[PDB]
Structure formats: structure tokens, C-alpha cells
């Protein structure tokens, strides 16, 4: 009786765990609190598990998460990803060389980037523009999206501030966007690994160990995830993290993000015209 992972589209989006030790009481994921309450967690029915500060994971627990193919993410403030673990063996050889070959050749790389551009904005990019130039186009379009979303919900907008120091305490808007995109990067990384590709090999983003995660996520981030973050910031709640967590998943549910994630990568890589595996 071997233990194999279930299809990712058939899973729950994400779970956040904090303040307790993680054990494997008789074959299953358990979270024991400081007061000693036990909480069984269905790791087979969860695409991604987020580990907040205060958690201590046992060796066997990490092992179980890999068998059922569940990505484990240690997160920081506003849900920023710190570390992650998973089945290192998991990856398709035919698909790895496919992604790599598409990335190494500049001509092939450019075709892939244009596909990302087209799928993201809904229109083809101007001809004979380089990656650096599309990146410039990207930024201009993004600033407009921020402004439009601000006007639609009634949010005080001063600009995108990435580091938590630059947040004006009562700002709550940037904390929501950074927390929202973090949730998307979580399930996206889990999707890429399950798809059998490398998260490190990117076309638009390069050099970063999660460049491909950023490439894929950016395409649909403002389509669903980010606008949901503005909804939360409008009401200005006490615990913006939780409401965003709840908000992003509901979006993932209605839009069937997990189901449409796997075909998107292959759709993107197809633009290279190299024979798909």
C-alpha cells in the first residue's frame, strides 16, 4: 500500500499553520498546540502548506509532505516566502530539457516572452522589442492598473512600497498586495514542480531561484489576485493578512486557478514552436 499524490486540481488551495509542533501521529499530519490540542491536517488534499513563525516540523512530517506531493513553505511577515521543501527527485527529465532549451536560445526565449505578454494584457507586443523593452512596457501598464484599481475601490494610493518599513502603519494597502501576490506565488511554485518544470529557469525574470514562478504568476496576478487585495484594504480591517488569505482562495475557487495553472505553462512554452513533450 504505497502513498501517491493526488491531482493538484482536485485539492484545497492553501493552509496556514502557526505556533505548534508538527508530528506524524500514526501516518498523518498533526499540529500540536502549546495547550496540547491536536489538529489533524489533510496534506493529501492540499496543494500548498504555509508554515508561519512558531512552527517546529519533524523529519517524518517533511517526509510525508513530499510523498503526497504537498509543497511546504516557511513564510515571513505579510506572507513573504522564506524557504521551501519538496521531493527533489520530482521533476520530468524530458520537460526539464524542454524548458531549458527554450530559455538558452535568445530567439526562442523572445518568442516565449511575447506569449506571456499577449496572454497577460490580451494583445500582441509591438514588433522588434527586446525583453528589456517589454519590461519597460510592463511597468507602465502596471502603474496604470494600480491607479485604475485605486479609483474603482476608493483606496488611498501613493505608490508601490515593497519593504515593510515604508508602510505608514495605517497604510494597509501595500501589505495587502504583498500578501496577496505571496499566496499566488505559493500555489504557482507548487504547480510548476507538480508540472515537472524548474522554478529557477525563467524567461522574463532571470537569475533568481524562482524566476519562472514570477513569470507565470505575473500573467494572471492583476486579473484576479491583486484586485481582490484592494477589496480588503478598502474596508481597512484589523487582521489584513487573514482576510486576504480568505479572499485569494475564494478567487482561486471561482476562477479555478489550480485547474488552469498547469495548462498555462505548456501554453506559454508552446510559443517556442519546439515539439511539446
Amino acid at each position: 500500500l504505497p502513498l501517491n499524490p493526488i491531482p493538484l486540481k482536485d485539492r484545497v488551495s492553501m493552509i496556514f499553520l502557526q505556533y505548534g509542533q508538527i508530528d506524524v501521529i500514526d501516518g498523518a499530519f498533526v499540529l500540536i498546540d502549546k495547550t496540547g490540542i491536536r489538529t489533524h491536517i489533510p496534506v493529501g488534499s492540499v496543494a500548498c502548506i504555509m508554515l508561519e513563525p512558531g512552527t517546529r516540523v519533524s523529519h517524518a512530517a517533511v517526509r510525508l509532505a513530499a510523498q503526497v506531493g504537498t509543497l511546504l513553505v516557511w513564510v515571513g511577515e505579510a506572507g513573504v516566502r522564506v524557504y521551501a521543501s519538496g521531493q527533489p527527485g520530482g521533476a520530468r527529465s524530458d520537460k526539464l530539457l524542454y524548458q531549458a532549451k527554450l530559455a538558452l536560445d535568445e530567439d526562442l526565449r523572445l518568442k516565449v516572452v511575447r506569449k506571456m505578454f499577449e496572454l497577460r494584457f490580451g494583445e500582441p507586443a509591438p514588433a522588434r522589442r527586446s525583453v528589456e523593452q517589454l519590461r519597460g512596457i510592463e511597468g507602465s501598464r502596471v502603474r496604470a492598473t494600480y491607479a485604475l484599481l485605486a479609483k474603482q475601490y476608493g483606496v488611498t494610493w501613493n505608490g508601490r512600497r515593497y519593504d515593510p518599513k515604508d508602510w505608514e502603519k495605517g497604510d494597509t494597502i501595500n501589505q495587502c498586495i504583498s500578501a496577496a501576490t505571496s499566496c499566488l506565488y505559493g500555489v504557482t511554485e507548487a504547480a510548476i514542480l507538480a508540472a515537472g518544470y524548474a522554478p529557477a529557469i525563467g524567461f522574463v525574470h532571470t537569475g533568481k531561484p524562482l524566476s519562472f514562478v514570477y513569470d507565470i504568476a505575473d500573467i494572471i496576478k492583476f486579473d484576479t489576485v491583486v484586485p481582490k487585495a484592494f477589496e480588503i484594504a478598502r474596508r481597512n480591517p484589523g487582521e489584513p493578512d487573514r482576510e486576504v488569505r480568505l479572499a485569494c482562495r475564494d478567487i482561486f475557487r471561482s476562477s479555478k486557478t489550480l485547474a488552469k495553472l498547469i495548462p498555462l505553462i505548456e501554453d506559454v512554452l508552446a510559443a517556442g514552436e519546439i515539439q511539446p513533450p
Binding site: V12, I37, R38, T39, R242, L246, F252
Partner: protein
Amino acid sequence: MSMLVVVTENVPPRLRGRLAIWLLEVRAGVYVGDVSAKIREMIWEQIAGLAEEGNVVMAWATNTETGFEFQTFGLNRRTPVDLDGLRLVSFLPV
């Protein structure tokens, strides 16, 4: 019409029999059925009214990605927990 599951403990014989008017009792205190939204709500009204000092949990299928929703009556060793909207269940110690 969606699937329905009712699990009862320490409830008076009145409620146990009442549930047996519509639902199938596969195990001791475990009822299964397939009812509409209204009938389900009527089932719960029977539960909250006829159960005393007992604890009941009822789960029905919905369109959430978990695929189902559950609500509890009374107090039990196993209490449901809300994890950012996602509801699991914890085990309380002594």
C-alpha cells in the same frame, strides 16, 4: 439536492428516531441522505430543538472547493477550527 450526513452523540431517543424518518442510519448515530436545501434546513431545526445536552454535527455537499460544509450543535471533544476560512477540527485534551 445534495448529500447529507448527520452524526449524533448523547441525544435523546426522540431525535434519533426523528432522523430515521428521512435518513438512513448506517452506523450508531451516523445518518446519511440526499435532501434539498429546505429539507436540510428543516432537518437542522429538528436537531437544534430535539437535542438536549447532546452534540450533533451535520455535513452537506456544496460548491466550495472542499466540496462540503459542516456546522455543529452543542459541545464535543472535537471542536471545529477556522483556518483563514478553511474549517478543520481540533482535539481538546484533559
